[PDB]
Amino acid sequence: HMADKELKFLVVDDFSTMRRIVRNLLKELGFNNVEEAEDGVDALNKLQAGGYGFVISDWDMPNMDGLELLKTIRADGAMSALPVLMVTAYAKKENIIAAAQAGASGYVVKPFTAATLEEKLNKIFEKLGM
Numbered sequence: 001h002m003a004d005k006e007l008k009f010l011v012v013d014d015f016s017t018m019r020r021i022v023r024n025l026l027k028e029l030g031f032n033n034v035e036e037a038e039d040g041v042d043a044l045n046k047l048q049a050g051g052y053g054f055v056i057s058d059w060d061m062p063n064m065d066g067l068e069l070l071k072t073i074r075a076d077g078a079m080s081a082l083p084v085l086m087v088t089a090y091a092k093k094e095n096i097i098a099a100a101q102a103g104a105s106g107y108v109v110k111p112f113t114a115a116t117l118e119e120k121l122n123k124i125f126e127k128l129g130m
């Protein structure tokens with residue numbers, strides 16, 4: 001998948017407020033193909049629905065937390081290379097390490113600015129040649 005306007009995003013967070021910030025930011029960046037999920041399980045259900053080219057995910061969520069969601073994606077042969085950008089309030093280095101090692105594409109700490117989100121998505125695009 002390429003970082004054109006068609007790229008389909010899944011935005012995962014247990015708080016709609018954060019999902020809403022991220023969707024609106026993506027729109028501003030020219031990405032309108034965006035769906036939401038409320039937790040890791042819901043997210044896996046949509047991911048299984050097919051078509052997604054990028055995940056942005058919270059960490060602390062009921063049902064399945066985002067570290068589990070990230071690991072699950074990375075271990076699944078059908079989606080193991082799916083970009084996953086963590087966006088979370090967890091700021092300790094051990095958290096950043098656990099997610100990095102689990103294969104996170106990137107990591108943004110809440111609260112974040114619009115410029116930061118844009119910068120970190122662009123870094124992932126460049127890295128993967130999207």
Ligand code: BEF
Binds near residue numbers: 090
């Ligand atoms: F709830 Be998230 F991890 F900020």
Ligand SMILES: [Mn+2]
Binds near residue numbers: 015058
């Ligand atoms: Mn949360």
